[PDB]
Design a binder for this molecule. Structure first.
Ligand code: SF4
Ligand SMILES: [Ca+2]
Length: 344
DNA sequence: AAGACGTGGAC
DNA sequence: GTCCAAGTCT
């Protein structure tokens, strides 16, 4: 019923599509940015970030020419920062190697950093009309119900099957709207919980509904870490911060010098990292910060700084009124907030 | 394959 | 507490 189905989906879409910021046009650059921001992130959260992001970097050229620090700052608080570092580099690549024109060939576009099987399909089909499937968790949730599939969507290979299913039923006469319509359905109707099957435009074609299992689909299958953090201030008002390693957790983001005490190292633990010297005091407070794969149990230690040498390594000395210029993980934003209300 | 990789918000 | 939401990389 490919053609019939395609009609009920696309029709519902034409009359129900939300007017979101990135839907004002089909500009490749803007679709690409939005698609990256939306990955594992709530639309309500992305909206403000996209509008601020595009206002700051209006075109692919603007983003390519910006310093990663300014870009990380624009991404501050969105999470999975590796997404923007991949995007930045891909945009630089497009500019220099492709003449600032986003490749419209899957094989060419897919080679860019951050562009996986979903993003190639999403960006090329919405912005160029290239008939490629754009399968992500949303699309897999929808198709697993329409075609009652019990394959764990967490399995690497499961996606390939759903992509096959899309190549099969896709409306080649307008893939962009077909791909985008599947996502809207998953977002507005066929939701994770309580899918609104009774008002669904493609209910007639749904196997999961016929069997009354729509709500059990799709089928889908952390370490605790004590962290010691020190807020160091000059007899003048400056504080010590540093730029995290360029690989791994919160890469290239700034933070207050910290140390994984993986136990009860304590104030002395951070002290050992003084090897430029200073001393600390009692812990201002302790709180937890969760990640997808771990939970940081942080403890903040106030301390005074006394200049006895240069400031090298990743370290950097910054005036209180200059901190708002660096991108800090949310956990360190609270560290500093705690510090400020403590002293105040 | 399976685990790294953030965050604010419904239940 | 749980489970996230329009994945990608290794
Ligand atoms: S009927 Fe229900 S489960 Fe089936 S596609 Fe519509 S909303 Fe999804
Ligand atoms: Ca790729």
């Amino acid at each position: 019923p490919a053609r019939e189905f395609q009609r009920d989906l696309l029709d519902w879409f034409a009359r129900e599509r939300r007017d979101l910021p990135w839907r004002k046009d089909r500009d490749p650059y803007k679709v690409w940015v939005s698609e990256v921001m939306l990955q594992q992130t709530r639309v309500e959260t992305v909206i403000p970030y996209f509008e601020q992001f595009i206002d700051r970097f209006p075109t692919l050229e603007a983003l390519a020419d910006a310093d990663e620090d300014e870009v990380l700052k624009a991404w501050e608080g969105l999470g999975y920062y590796s997404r923007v570092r991949n995007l930045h580099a891909a945009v630089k690549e497009v500019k220099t190697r492709y003449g600032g024109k986003v490749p419209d060939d899957p094989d060419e576009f897919s080679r860019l950093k951050g562009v996986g099987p979903y993003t190639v399909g999403a960006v090329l089909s919405l912005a160029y009309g290239v008939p490629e499937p754009a399968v992500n968790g949303n699309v897999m949730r929808v198709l697993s119900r329409l075609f009652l599939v019990t394959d764990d969507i967490a399995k690497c290979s499961t996606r390939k099957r759903f992509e096959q299913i899309v190549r099969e039923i896709m409306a080649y006469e307008n893939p962009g709207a077909f791909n985008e319509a599947l996502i809207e359905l998953g977002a507005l109707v066929c939701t994770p919980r309580r899918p609104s099957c009774l008002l669904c435009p493609v209910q007639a074609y749904c196997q999961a509904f016929a069997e009354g299992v729509a709500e059990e689909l799709p089928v889908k299958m952390v370490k605790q870490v004590p962290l010691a953090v020190a807020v160091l201030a000059d007899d003048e008002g400056r504080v010590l911060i540093r730029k995290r390693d360029s690989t791994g957790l919160l890469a290239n983001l700034w933070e207050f010098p910290s140390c994984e005490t993986d136990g009860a190292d304590g104030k002395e633990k951070l002290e050992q990292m003084v090897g430029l010297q200073v001393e600390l005091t009692e812990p201002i407070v302790s709180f937890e910060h969760a990640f997808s794969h771990l939970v940081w149990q942080l403890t903040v230690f106030p301390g005074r700084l006394v200049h006895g040498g240069p400031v090298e390594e990743p370290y950097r000395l910054a005036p209180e009124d200059e901190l708002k210029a660096y991108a800090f993980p949310v956990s360190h934003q609270r560290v500093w907030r705690e510090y400020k209300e403590w002293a105040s």
